[PDB]
Protein backbone atom coordinates (compact mmCIF):
# COMPACT_ATOMS: atom_id res chain seq x y z
CA UNK A 1 0.00 0.00 0.00
CA UNK A 2 2.96 2.29 0.68
CA UNK A 3 4.11 1.92 -2.93
CA UNK A 4 1.01 3.68 -4.29
CA UNK A 5 0.96 6.37 -1.60
CA UNK A 6 4.49 7.43 -2.52
CA UNK A 7 3.56 7.39 -6.21
CA UNK A 8 0.49 9.52 -5.51
CA UNK A 9 2.04 11.70 -2.82
CA UNK A 10 5.25 12.04 -4.84
CA UNK A 11 3.10 13.62 -7.53
CA UNK A 12 1.42 15.60 -4.76
CA UNK A 13 4.88 16.78 -3.75
CA UNK A 14 5.29 17.87 -7.36
CA UNK A 15 1.96 19.67 -6.98
CA UNK A 16 3.05 21.23 -3.69
CA UNK A 17 6.36 22.13 -5.31
CA UNK A 18 4.51 23.69 -8.23
CA UNK A 19 2.16 25.41 -5.77
CA UNK A 20 5.13 27.40 -4.49
CA UNK A 21 6.00 28.28 -8.08
CA UNK A 22 2.59 29.84 -8.70
CA UNK A 23 2.71 31.89 -5.50
CA UNK A 24 6.24 32.77 -6.63
CA UNK A 25 4.73 34.32 -9.77
CA UNK A 26 1.62 36.42 -9.22
CA UNK A 27 2.98 38.82 -6.60
CA UNK A 28 5.63 40.33 -8.87
CA UNK A 29 3.38 40.45 -11.93
CA UNK A 30 1.57 43.46 -10.50
CA UNK A 31 4.89 45.18 -9.75
CA UNK A 32 6.01 44.06 -13.20
CA UNK A 33 2.70 45.44 -14.48
CA UNK A 34 2.57 48.51 -12.26
CA UNK A 35 5.89 50.15 -13.06
CA UNK A 36 5.29 49.35 -16.73
CA UNK A 37 1.67 50.47 -16.40
CA UNK A 38 2.91 53.77 -14.99
CA UNK A 39 5.20 53.98 -18.02
CA UNK A 40 2.25 53.49 -20.39
CA UNK A 41 0.61 56.60 -18.97
CA UNK A 42 4.12 58.03 -19.20
CA UNK A 43 3.64 57.70 -22.93
CA UNK A 44 0.56 59.91 -22.73
CA UNK A 45 2.45 62.33 -20.51
CA UNK A 46 5.19 62.00 -23.11
CA UNK A 47 2.59 62.43 -25.86
CA UNK A 48 2.17 65.95 -24.51
CA UNK A 49 5.90 66.23 -23.84
CA UNK A 50 6.54 65.38 -27.49
CA UNK A 51 4.42 68.39 -28.41
CA UNK A 52 5.95 70.33 -25.52
CA UNK A 53 9.48 69.95 -26.88
CA UNK A 54 8.31 70.85 -30.38
CA UNK A 55 6.76 73.99 -28.92
CA UNK A 56 10.12 74.55 -27.24
CA UNK A 57 12.57 73.89 -30.09
CA UNK A 58 10.49 76.09 -32.39
CA UNK A 59 10.36 79.02 -29.97
CA UNK A 60 14.13 78.82 -29.58
CA UNK A 61 15.05 77.93 -33.16
CA UNK A 62 13.06 80.91 -34.42
CA UNK A 63 14.97 83.16 -32.01
CA UNK A 64 18.49 82.28 -33.15
CA UNK A 65 16.99 82.33 -36.64
CA UNK A 66 16.02 85.97 -36.08
CA UNK A 67 19.22 86.95 -34.28
CA UNK A 68 21.68 85.27 -36.65
CA UNK A 69 20.41 87.48 -39.47
CA UNK A 70 20.76 90.39 -37.06
CA UNK A 71 24.23 89.07 -36.30
CA UNK A 72 24.83 88.78 -40.03
CA UNK A 73 23.50 92.31 -40.39
CA UNK A 74 26.13 93.79 -38.09
CA UNK A 75 28.80 92.18 -40.25
CA UNK A 76 26.82 93.32 -43.28
CA UNK A 77 26.68 96.66 -41.49
CA UNK A 78 30.39 96.23 -40.81
CA UNK A 79 30.88 95.92 -44.56
CA UNK A 80 29.38 99.41 -44.82
CA UNK A 81 32.16 100.54 -42.49
CA UNK A 82 34.52 98.77 -44.88
CA UNK A 83 32.68 100.50 -47.71
CA UNK A 84 32.91 103.68 -45.63
CA UNK A 85 36.67 103.22 -45.41
CA UNK A 86 36.34 102.62 -49.14
CA UNK A 87 34.61 106.01 -49.33
CA UNK A 88 37.35 107.83 -47.37
CA UNK A 89 38.81 106.30 -33.81
CA UNK A 90 41.08 103.38 -32.97
CA UNK A 91 38.46 101.40 -31.03
CA UNK A 92 36.99 100.34 -34.36
CA UNK A 93 40.03 98.04 -34.58
CA UNK A 94 39.35 96.49 -31.19
CA UNK A 95 35.86 95.99 -32.61
CA UNK A 96 37.44 94.18 -35.54
CA UNK A 97 39.49 92.08 -33.13
CA UNK A 98 36.43 90.99 -31.16
CA UNK A 99 34.76 90.10 -34.45
CA UNK A 100 37.77 87.85 -34.99
CA UNK A 101 36.98 86.29 -31.62
CA UNK A 102 33.60 85.51 -33.17
CA UNK A 103 35.42 83.58 -35.89
CA UNK A 104 36.95 81.44 -33.15
CA UNK A 105 33.55 80.65 -31.65
CA UNK A 106 32.12 80.61 -35.16
CA UNK A 107 34.40 77.70 -36.04
CA UNK A 108 32.52 75.58 -33.49
CA UNK A 109 30.16 75.13 -36.42
CA UNK A 110 33.14 73.89 -38.45
CA UNK A 111 34.09 71.30 -35.84
CA UNK A 112 30.43 70.26 -35.81
CA UNK A 113 29.93 70.26 -39.58
CA UNK A 114 32.84 67.90 -40.03
CA UNK A 115 31.09 65.88 -37.35
CA UNK A 116 27.92 66.39 -39.37
CA UNK A 117 29.98 65.09 -42.29
CA UNK A 118 30.78 62.08 -40.10
CA UNK A 119 27.12 61.06 -40.20
CA UNK A 120 26.98 61.97 -43.90
CA UNK A 121 29.40 59.07 -44.49
CA UNK A 122 28.46 56.93 -41.49
CA UNK A 123 25.08 56.61 -43.20
CA UNK A 124 26.20 56.37 -46.83
CA UNK A 125 27.95 53.02 -46.32
CA UNK A 126 24.63 51.58 -45.19
CA UNK A 127 24.77 47.79 -45.45
CA UNK A 128 28.52 47.89 -46.03
CA UNK A 129 29.15 49.44 -42.60
CA UNK A 130 29.68 45.99 -41.09
CA UNK A 131 32.71 45.35 -43.30
CA UNK A 132 34.26 48.74 -42.61
CA UNK A 133 33.56 48.22 -38.91
CA UNK A 134 35.18 44.78 -38.97
CA UNK A 135 38.45 46.74 -39.11
CA UNK A 136 37.68 47.88 -35.54
CA UNK A 137 35.29 45.05 -34.57
CA UNK A 138 37.37 41.87 -35.05
CA UNK A 139 36.40 40.88 -31.51
CA UNK A 140 32.88 40.13 -32.71
CA UNK A 141 34.10 37.91 -35.55
CA UNK A 142 36.26 35.90 -33.17
CA UNK A 143 33.04 34.70 -31.54
CA UNK A 144 32.18 33.13 -34.88
CA UNK A 145 35.84 32.17 -35.32
CA UNK A 146 35.19 30.20 -32.15
CA UNK A 147 31.91 28.98 -33.64
CA UNK A 148 33.92 27.97 -36.70
CA UNK A 149 35.50 25.31 -34.47
CA UNK A 150 32.12 23.64 -34.90
CA UNK A 151 33.36 23.46 -38.51
CA UNK A 152 36.97 22.33 -38.19
CA UNK A 153 37.39 22.44 -41.97
CA UNK A 154 36.31 26.10 -41.78
CA UNK A 155 38.29 26.91 -38.60
CA UNK A 156 41.21 28.71 -40.23
CA UNK A 157 39.29 29.59 -43.39
CA UNK A 158 36.67 31.52 -41.41
CA UNK A 159 39.33 34.08 -40.45
CA UNK A 160 39.13 35.91 -43.79
CA UNK A 161 35.34 35.48 -44.08
CA UNK A 162 34.92 38.06 -41.30
CA UNK A 163 34.27 40.79 -43.87
CA UNK A 164 30.90 39.56 -45.24
CA UNK A 165 30.29 37.65 -41.99
CA UNK A 166 27.78 40.07 -40.46
CA UNK A 167 25.44 39.54 -43.43
CA UNK A 168 26.61 36.06 -44.52
CA UNK A 169 28.02 34.21 -41.50
CA UNK A 170 24.83 35.37 -39.77
CA UNK A 171 23.30 32.20 -41.21
CA UNK A 172 25.99 30.12 -39.50
CA UNK A 173 25.11 31.94 -36.28
CA UNK A 174 21.46 31.24 -37.08
CA UNK A 175 21.72 27.67 -38.37
CA UNK A 176 24.21 26.61 -35.70
CA UNK A 177 22.62 28.29 -32.69
CA UNK A 178 19.08 27.74 -33.97
CA UNK A 179 19.75 24.08 -34.76
CA UNK A 180 21.53 23.28 -31.50
CA UNK A 181 18.77 25.32 -29.86
CA UNK A 182 15.96 23.56 -31.71
CA UNK A 183 17.84 20.28 -31.38
CA UNK A 184 18.00 21.00 -27.65
CA UNK A 185 14.28 21.72 -27.38
CA UNK A 186 12.89 18.69 -29.22
CA UNK A 187 15.77 16.47 -30.33
CA UNK A 188 18.26 16.43 -27.48
CA UNK A 189 15.69 15.01 -25.03
CA UNK A 190 12.99 13.77 -27.36
CA UNK A 191 15.02 11.81 -29.90
CA UNK A 192 17.29 10.39 -27.21
CA UNK A 193 14.39 9.37 -24.97
CA UNK A 194 12.47 8.17 -28.03
CA UNK A 195 15.43 6.14 -29.29
CA UNK A 196 15.89 4.61 -25.85
CA UNK A 197 12.48 2.94 -25.71
CA UNK A 198 13.37 1.02 -28.86
CA UNK A 199 16.08 -0.83 -26.97
CA UNK A 200 13.41 -1.37 -24.32
CA UNK A 201 11.23 -2.94 -27.02
CA UNK A 202 14.26 -5.05 -27.91
CA UNK A 203 14.50 -6.48 -24.40
CA UNK A 204 10.71 -6.71 -24.70
CA UNK A 205 10.24 -8.84 -27.80
CA UNK A 206 13.24 -11.02 -26.94
CA UNK A 207 11.79 -11.56 -23.46
CA UNK A 208 8.17 -11.82 -24.57
CA UNK A 209 8.71 -14.48 -27.25
CA UNK A 210 12.34 -15.59 -27.61
CA UNK A 211 12.93 -16.14 -23.88
CA UNK A 212 9.55 -16.30 -22.14
CA UNK A 213 7.53 -18.03 -24.87
CA UNK A 214 10.40 -20.27 -25.97
CA UNK A 215 11.03 -21.40 -22.39
CA UNK A 216 7.28 -21.48 -21.74
CA UNK A 217 6.65 -24.06 -24.48
CA UNK A 218 9.63 -26.36 -24.87
CA UNK A 219 10.23 -27.49 -21.25
CA UNK A 220 6.52 -28.26 -20.73
CA UNK A 221 5.76 -29.91 -24.08
CA UNK A 222 8.97 -31.96 -24.05
CA UNK A 223 8.98 -33.97 -20.78
CA UNK A 224 5.94 -36.14 -21.54
CA UNK A 225 7.39 -38.44 -24.26
CA UNK A 226 10.63 -38.68 -22.27
CA UNK A 227 8.96 -40.59 -19.44
CA UNK A 228 6.38 -42.44 -21.57
CA UNK A 229 8.73 -44.41 -23.83
CA UNK A 230 11.14 -44.96 -20.95
CA UNK A 231 8.12 -46.44 -19.17
CA UNK A 232 8.10 -49.25 -21.74
CA UNK A 233 11.89 -49.43 -21.36
CA UNK A 234 11.33 -50.70 -17.82
Amino acid sequence: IKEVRDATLAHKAEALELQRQLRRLQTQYDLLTGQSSALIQGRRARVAATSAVSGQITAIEDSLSARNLQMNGVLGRLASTSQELAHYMLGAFSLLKVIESELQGYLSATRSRVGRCSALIQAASDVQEQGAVDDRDSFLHGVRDLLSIHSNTQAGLSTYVSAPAIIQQIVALQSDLSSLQSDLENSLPDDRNRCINELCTHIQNLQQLLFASSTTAQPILTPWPLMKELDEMG
Partner: protein, 244 residues
Protein backbone atom coordinates in the same frame (compact mmCIF):
# COMPACT_ATOMS: atom_id res chain seq x y z
CA UNK B 1 -9.36 0.74 -0.48
CA UNK B 2 -8.20 0.99 -4.09
CA UNK B 3 -10.58 3.92 -4.62
CA UNK B 4 -9.28 5.68 -1.50
CA UNK B 5 -5.72 5.61 -2.83
CA UNK B 6 -7.07 6.64 -6.24
CA UNK B 7 -8.67 9.69 -4.62
CA UNK B 8 -5.31 10.57 -3.10
CA UNK B 9 -4.10 10.51 -6.71
CA UNK B 10 -7.17 12.49 -7.78
CA UNK B 11 -6.47 15.50 -5.57
CA UNK B 12 -2.96 15.64 -7.01
CA UNK B 13 -4.03 14.85 -10.56
CA UNK B 14 -6.37 17.78 -11.05
CA UNK B 15 -4.26 20.72 -9.85
CA UNK B 16 -1.00 19.44 -11.30
CA UNK B 17 -1.69 20.88 -14.74
CA UNK B 18 -3.35 24.00 -13.35
CA UNK B 19 -0.16 25.24 -11.68
CA UNK B 20 2.16 24.85 -14.67
CA UNK B 21 -0.45 25.86 -17.24
CA UNK B 22 -1.49 29.11 -15.58
CA UNK B 23 2.18 29.84 -14.88
CA UNK B 24 3.46 29.17 -18.38
CA UNK B 25 0.67 31.06 -20.15
CA UNK B 26 1.56 34.05 -17.99
CA UNK B 27 5.22 33.28 -18.65
CA UNK B 28 4.81 34.10 -22.34
CA UNK B 29 2.66 37.15 -21.59
CA UNK B 30 5.25 38.30 -19.05
CA UNK B 31 8.00 38.03 -21.64
CA UNK B 32 6.20 40.33 -24.07
CA UNK B 33 5.44 42.90 -21.37
CA UNK B 34 9.16 43.13 -20.65
CA UNK B 35 10.11 43.81 -24.26
CA UNK B 36 6.82 45.61 -24.88
CA UNK B 37 7.86 48.21 -22.30
CA UNK B 38 11.50 48.23 -23.41
CA UNK B 39 10.73 49.72 -26.82
CA UNK B 40 8.60 52.46 -25.24
CA UNK B 41 10.85 53.22 -22.30
CA UNK B 42 13.29 53.39 -25.19
CA UNK B 43 11.03 56.04 -26.70
CA UNK B 44 11.69 57.92 -23.48
CA UNK B 45 15.39 57.59 -24.24
CA UNK B 46 15.16 58.65 -27.88
CA UNK B 47 12.80 61.29 -26.53
CA UNK B 48 15.27 62.13 -23.77
CA UNK B 49 17.93 62.97 -26.35
CA UNK B 50 15.45 65.30 -28.04
CA UNK B 51 15.06 67.02 -24.69
CA UNK B 52 18.78 67.06 -23.94
CA UNK B 53 20.18 68.40 -27.21
CA UNK B 54 17.30 70.82 -27.70
CA UNK B 55 17.87 72.00 -24.13
CA UNK B 56 21.49 72.52 -25.16
CA UNK B 57 20.18 74.46 -28.15
CA UNK B 58 18.17 76.50 -25.68
CA UNK B 59 21.47 76.93 -23.87
CA UNK B 60 23.19 77.68 -27.17
CA UNK B 61 20.50 80.23 -27.97
CA UNK B 62 21.19 81.79 -24.59
CA UNK B 63 24.91 81.34 -25.27
CA UNK B 64 24.86 82.93 -28.73
CA UNK B 65 22.55 85.56 -27.27
CA UNK B 66 25.50 86.15 -24.95
CA UNK B 67 27.83 86.27 -27.94
CA UNK B 68 25.65 88.73 -29.88
CA UNK B 69 24.38 91.06 -27.16
CA UNK B 70 27.82 92.57 -26.54
CA UNK B 71 29.00 91.87 -30.08
CA UNK B 72 25.98 93.61 -31.59
CA UNK B 73 26.42 96.25 -28.88
CA UNK B 74 30.04 97.15 -29.56
CA UNK B 75 29.80 97.74 -33.31
CA UNK B 76 27.06 100.36 -33.41
CA UNK B 77 28.74 103.35 -31.74
CA UNK B 78 31.75 102.96 -34.02
CA UNK B 79 29.30 102.45 -36.89
CA UNK B 80 27.24 105.45 -35.79
CA UNK B 81 30.25 107.77 -35.57
CA UNK B 82 30.99 106.99 -39.23
CA UNK B 83 27.32 106.62 -40.20
CA UNK B 84 26.22 110.03 -38.92
CA UNK B 85 46.18 99.39 -45.25
CA UNK B 86 43.66 98.70 -42.46
CA UNK B 87 40.94 98.80 -45.13
CA UNK B 88 42.31 95.58 -46.65
CA UNK B 89 42.04 93.66 -43.37
CA UNK B 90 38.46 94.84 -42.91
CA UNK B 91 37.69 93.93 -46.53
CA UNK B 92 39.09 90.43 -46.12
CA UNK B 93 37.11 90.44 -42.88
CA UNK B 94 34.09 91.34 -45.01
CA UNK B 95 34.81 88.21 -47.03
CA UNK B 96 34.75 86.46 -43.65
CA UNK B 97 31.20 87.74 -43.15
CA UNK B 98 30.11 86.50 -46.57
CA UNK B 99 30.93 82.92 -45.56
CA UNK B 100 29.70 83.66 -42.04
CA UNK B 101 26.34 84.69 -43.51
CA UNK B 102 25.26 81.25 -44.68
CA UNK B 103 27.22 79.67 -41.84
CA UNK B 104 25.15 81.58 -39.34
CA UNK B 105 22.07 80.28 -41.16
CA UNK B 106 23.28 76.74 -40.48
CA UNK B 107 23.32 77.68 -36.80
CA UNK B 108 19.59 77.01 -37.21
CA UNK B 109 19.81 74.47 -40.03
CA UNK B 110 22.11 72.34 -37.88
CA UNK B 111 18.98 71.00 -36.21
CA UNK B 112 17.63 69.93 -39.60
CA UNK B 113 16.64 66.22 -39.41
CA UNK B 114 20.20 65.46 -40.50
CA UNK B 115 21.38 66.31 -36.99
CA UNK B 116 18.27 64.55 -35.71
CA UNK B 117 20.01 61.46 -37.15
CA UNK B 118 23.49 62.59 -36.13
CA UNK B 119 21.94 62.69 -32.65
CA UNK B 120 22.31 58.91 -32.51
CA UNK B 121 25.88 59.08 -31.06
CA UNK B 122 25.90 62.82 -30.42
CA UNK B 123 23.70 63.52 -27.38
CA UNK B 124 25.67 60.83 -25.50
CA UNK B 125 28.92 62.42 -26.71
CA UNK B 126 30.95 59.67 -25.05
CA UNK B 127 29.58 57.36 -27.75
CA UNK B 128 30.49 59.73 -30.59
CA UNK B 129 34.15 59.66 -31.62
CA UNK B 130 35.05 56.80 -33.94
CA UNK B 131 38.74 57.12 -32.91
CA UNK B 132 37.59 56.65 -29.29
CA UNK B 133 34.66 54.21 -29.36
CA UNK B 134 34.22 52.67 -32.85
CA UNK B 135 35.05 49.32 -31.21
CA UNK B 136 33.20 50.24 -28.00
CA UNK B 137 29.92 50.91 -29.83
CA UNK B 138 30.09 47.24 -30.79
CA UNK B 139 30.99 45.94 -27.31
CA UNK B 140 29.57 48.15 -24.56
CA UNK B 141 26.74 49.86 -26.44
CA UNK B 142 25.52 47.00 -28.64
CA UNK B 143 23.68 45.33 -25.77
CA UNK B 144 21.98 48.69 -25.17
CA UNK B 145 21.20 50.21 -28.59
CA UNK B 146 19.96 46.96 -30.13
CA UNK B 147 16.28 47.74 -30.97
CA UNK B 148 16.95 50.97 -32.85
CA UNK B 149 18.99 48.87 -35.29
CA UNK B 150 15.72 48.02 -37.01
CA UNK B 151 15.48 51.74 -37.87
CA UNK B 152 19.06 52.98 -37.57
CA UNK B 153 20.91 50.64 -39.92
CA UNK B 154 24.35 51.38 -38.42
CA UNK B 155 23.53 49.48 -35.23
CA UNK B 156 21.85 46.66 -37.16
CA UNK B 157 25.27 45.09 -37.68
CA UNK B 158 25.27 44.41 -33.93
CA UNK B 159 21.52 43.80 -33.75
CA UNK B 160 20.68 41.38 -36.56
CA UNK B 161 23.16 38.89 -35.12
CA UNK B 162 21.38 39.22 -31.78
CA UNK B 163 18.05 39.36 -33.60
CA UNK B 164 18.97 35.90 -34.87
CA UNK B 165 20.08 34.99 -31.35
CA UNK B 166 16.69 36.23 -30.19
CA UNK B 167 16.25 33.05 -28.15
CA UNK B 168 19.37 34.17 -26.28
CA UNK B 169 17.76 37.56 -25.61
CA UNK B 170 14.50 35.93 -24.50
CA UNK B 171 16.36 34.22 -21.66
CA UNK B 172 18.30 37.42 -20.83
CA UNK B 173 16.04 40.16 -22.17
CA UNK B 174 17.45 43.04 -20.16
CA UNK B 175 20.74 42.46 -18.35
CA UNK B 176 21.74 38.81 -18.76
CA UNK B 177 22.55 39.50 -22.43
CA UNK B 178 25.86 41.14 -21.53
CA UNK B 179 27.27 37.95 -19.98
CA UNK B 180 26.28 35.39 -22.62
CA UNK B 181 28.17 37.71 -24.99
CA UNK B 182 31.04 35.70 -23.49
CA UNK B 183 29.43 32.48 -22.29
CA UNK B 184 27.00 31.67 -25.12
CA UNK B 185 29.64 30.63 -27.66
CA UNK B 186 30.78 28.02 -25.13
CA UNK B 187 27.18 27.11 -24.30
CA UNK B 188 26.53 26.09 -27.90
CA UNK B 189 29.78 24.12 -27.71
CA UNK B 190 28.47 22.48 -24.54
CA UNK B 191 25.21 21.72 -26.33
CA UNK B 192 27.32 20.50 -29.24
CA UNK B 193 29.14 18.52 -26.57
CA UNK B 194 25.79 17.23 -25.31
CA UNK B 195 24.58 16.10 -28.73
CA UNK B 196 28.02 14.53 -29.00
CA UNK B 197 26.94 12.66 -25.88
CA UNK B 198 24.20 11.22 -28.06
CA UNK B 199 26.92 10.57 -30.62
CA UNK B 200 29.10 8.82 -28.01
CA UNK B 201 26.24 6.40 -27.39
CA UNK B 202 24.53 6.44 -30.79
CA UNK B 203 27.90 5.62 -32.35
CA UNK B 204 27.42 2.09 -31.02
CA UNK B 205 23.72 2.12 -30.09
CA UNK B 206 22.67 2.59 -33.72
CA UNK B 207 24.50 -0.63 -34.55
CA UNK B 208 22.57 -2.24 -31.69
CA UNK B 209 19.16 -1.23 -33.03
CA UNK B 210 20.55 -1.91 -36.50
CA UNK B 211 21.93 -5.22 -35.23
CA UNK B 212 18.83 -6.29 -33.34
CA UNK B 213 15.89 -5.53 -35.62
CA UNK B 214 17.79 -7.78 -38.05
CA UNK B 215 19.25 -10.37 -35.69
CA UNK B 216 16.20 -10.35 -33.40
CA UNK B 217 13.73 -10.78 -36.25
CA UNK B 218 15.60 -13.82 -37.58
CA UNK B 219 15.24 -15.47 -34.19
CA UNK B 220 11.62 -14.35 -33.96
CA UNK B 221 10.77 -15.43 -37.49
CA UNK B 222 12.76 -18.67 -37.52
CA UNK B 223 11.57 -19.68 -34.06
CA UNK B 224 7.98 -19.02 -35.13
CA UNK B 225 8.19 -21.22 -38.22
CA UNK B 226 10.05 -23.81 -36.16
CA UNK B 227 7.46 -23.70 -33.38
CA UNK B 228 4.49 -23.97 -35.74
CA UNK B 229 6.12 -27.09 -37.23
CA UNK B 230 7.40 -29.04 -34.20
CA UNK B 231 4.09 -28.29 -32.46
CA UNK B 232 2.37 -30.73 -34.81
CA UNK B 233 5.24 -33.16 -34.11
CA UNK B 234 5.25 -33.45 -30.31
CA UNK B 235 1.71 -34.85 -30.45
CA UNK B 236 2.84 -37.71 -32.75
CA UNK B 237 5.53 -38.49 -30.17
CA UNK B 238 2.61 -39.57 -27.98
CA UNK B 239 0.77 -41.25 -30.87
CA UNK B 240 3.67 -43.70 -31.03
CA UNK B 241 2.89 -44.75 -27.44
CA UNK B 242 -0.83 -44.44 -26.71
CA UNK B 243 -1.50 -47.94 -28.03
CA UNK B 244 1.86 -49.05 -26.60
Amino acid sequence: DREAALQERELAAKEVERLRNIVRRQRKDLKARMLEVSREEAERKRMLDERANYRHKQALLEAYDQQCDEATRIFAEYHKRLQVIPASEVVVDISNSAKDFIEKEVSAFFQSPDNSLYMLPATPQGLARDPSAIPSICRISAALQYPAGLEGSDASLASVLESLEFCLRVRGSEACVLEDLAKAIDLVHIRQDLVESGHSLLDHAFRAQQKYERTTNYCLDLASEQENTISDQWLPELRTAVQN
